Amino acid sequence: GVVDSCCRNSCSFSTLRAYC
Amino acid sequence: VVDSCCRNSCSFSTLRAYCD
Amino acid sequence: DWLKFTKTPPTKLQQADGATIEIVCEMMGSQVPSIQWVVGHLPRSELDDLDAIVRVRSSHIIDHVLSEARTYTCVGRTGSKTIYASTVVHPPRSTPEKTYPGAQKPRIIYTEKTHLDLMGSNIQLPCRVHARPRAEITWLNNENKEIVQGHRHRVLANGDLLISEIKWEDMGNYKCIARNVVGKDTADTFVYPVLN
Amino acid sequence: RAFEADWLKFTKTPPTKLQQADGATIEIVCEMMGSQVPSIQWVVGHLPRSELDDLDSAIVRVRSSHIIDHVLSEARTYTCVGRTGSKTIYASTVVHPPRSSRLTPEKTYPGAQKPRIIYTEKTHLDLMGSNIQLPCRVHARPRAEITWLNNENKEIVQGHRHRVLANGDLLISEIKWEDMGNYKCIARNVVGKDTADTFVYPVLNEE
Amino acid sequence: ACGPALMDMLRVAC
Amino acid sequence: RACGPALMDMLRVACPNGF
């Protein structure tokens, strides 16, 4: 469910890598 | 030439006239 | 920093008379890697300019029958890292060395499949067509409207689209449309702006 | 146009043969002038047909040089390809390795490298209100950093019109005559610098 | 919209 | 001004016949 949270915000980097 | 063109802008047409 | 193939060109190919072969090699890696092709056996020779994440694809078009086998090496380069694969194309068993003749469809030979960067940073997505006659580049956007040169965006001399100081609104799927008389080709570069 | 002319001519022609003085660094230069923004490309070997792009006003004189920084195991031919529009010309250099060597053949010289600007435009003529992209392409290890000087010689700052790209290319937009002059590329890294001047002349009009 | 990209990105990145 | 022989230099390559 990366897309739902990370994409929507959208997230930045380290948050993305944390996912993964 | 230089005087003709450099002092003011020169047309592409105008430059050709200079060619020998 | 890293660099990995995501698509690798096959290590051997067999040509077919009357056919046009497109070799495709793509990679993902840090800070805008750059793909380059060279033909022949070379040991380690060097090129071509020494002055965020990106997945970039590039292809080589063999549009004329071979007179001998040849090797085409696709070279990837970001910063310290450098990676390579080769394809050997055997000529068919059945005019060699004569580019096929007359109009050819555009094939987009250099594009970026996915681009990640930090906001406020200017990015330049590339479209390099290969097509005869010479094709025309039109750039669609995230909501599929033709680009306007607003100084927000600028389509460059080479077909590369320059999106200045990216922001969230800008995130999405950008498309390149290359058209000439005998057809079209199209490619979408994702864009995702990460934040500091 | 049209069926032509689209032209292309050699201003500086690479020499037909060179001898690699041992542990030498050989830089081969070819420079050419023609219509549109020509492109120089280098390839090693003997090749029949060739492949550059392909994504198709103005007259431009371009320089490009190839840097061999390692000792050759065998002779090699270095070919410079020039292509504006439907034209193509090429010139070739065969570089003999030295007679004897105290070095490993085919091993890039190790060490710091002073910048060399390998790709520059000596003269760029285009019509007023046209956008130009001047190049500086450096070959320096460590990686060099490009500063651009205008005709006045004042450094260049990001803005409307003048703008410096990631490639090192300087992009001037909707050019006026106020812009005419000589523009300088300074490439500098930890060991030193090299410089290039790109003469620009906006033409008019018609009008 | 962006759904697939990150996953498509995801495999490669880590 | 600055163009000076830049033009002259350009022309000699540029034309069929040069000066």
Numbering used by the authors:
A (entry chain I): 4 to 23
B (entry chain G): 5 to 24
C (entry chain A): 31 to 81, 92 to 134, 138 to 239
D (entry chain B): 26 to 81, 91 to 241
E (entry chain J): 5 to 18
F (entry chain H): 4 to 22
Paper text:
Imp-L2 can bind human IGF-1, IGF-2, insulin, and DILP5 with nM affinities, it counteracts insulin signalling in Drosophila being essential for resistance to starvation, while its overexpression leads to an extension of the lifespan. Here, we report the crystal structures of the Drosophila Imp-L2 protein in its apo-form, and in holo-complexes with insect DILP5 and human IGF-1. The three-dimensional characterisation of the Imp-L2 IBP in its free and hormone-complex forms revealed its fold and hormone-binding mode that are entirely different from, and unrelated to, IGFBP-1-6. The apo-Imp-L2 consists of two, similar, immunoglobulin-(Ig)-like fold domains, each of them with two-sandwiched layers of ~6–7 anti-parallel β-strands.
The Imp-L2:DILP5 complex revealed 1:1 Imp-L2:hormone mode of binding. Imp-L2:DILP5 complex formation is correlated with the propensity of Imp-L2 to form a new type of the dimer. The crystal asymmetric unit contains here two independent, but practically identical dimers (rms of 1.0 Å), that are entirely different from the apo-Imp-L2 dimer (discussed further in detail in relation to the Imp-L2 apo→holo related quaternary transitions). The DILP5 hormone binds to Imp-L2 top id-β-sheet mainly by its B-helix that is almost perpendicular to the direction of id-β-strands. The helix runs in Ig-CT→Ig-NT direction, and is mostly engaged with the N- and C-termini part of the id-β surface. The hormone B-chain α−helix:Imp-L2 β-sheet interactions are depleted of specific, tight and directional side-chain:side-chain contacts, which are mostly of a van der Waals, hydrophobic nature over ca. ~835 Å2 buried interface. The Imp-L2 contributes βB-βE:βAC-βG-βF strands to the complex (mainly Trp32, Met58, Ile93, Leu159, Trp211, Met214, Phe233, Tyr215), while B-helix side chains are limited here to AlaB9, MetB13, ValB16, AlaB17. However, there is also more specific shape complementarity between DILP5 B-chain and the id-β-sheet as, for example, hormone MetB13 fills a hydrophobic cavity formed by Met58, Trp32, Ile93 and Leu159 of the Imp-L2. Firstly, the conformation of the N-terminus of B-chain (B1–B5) of DLP5 must change, as its extended—so-called T-like—structure, observed in its free state39 and in some insulins, would clash with the id-β-sheet surface. The positioning of the hormone on the id-β-sheet leads to a greater separation of the N- and C-termini of the Imp-L2, from ~12 Å in apo-Imp-L2, to over 20 Å distance between the Cα atoms at sites 30 and 240.
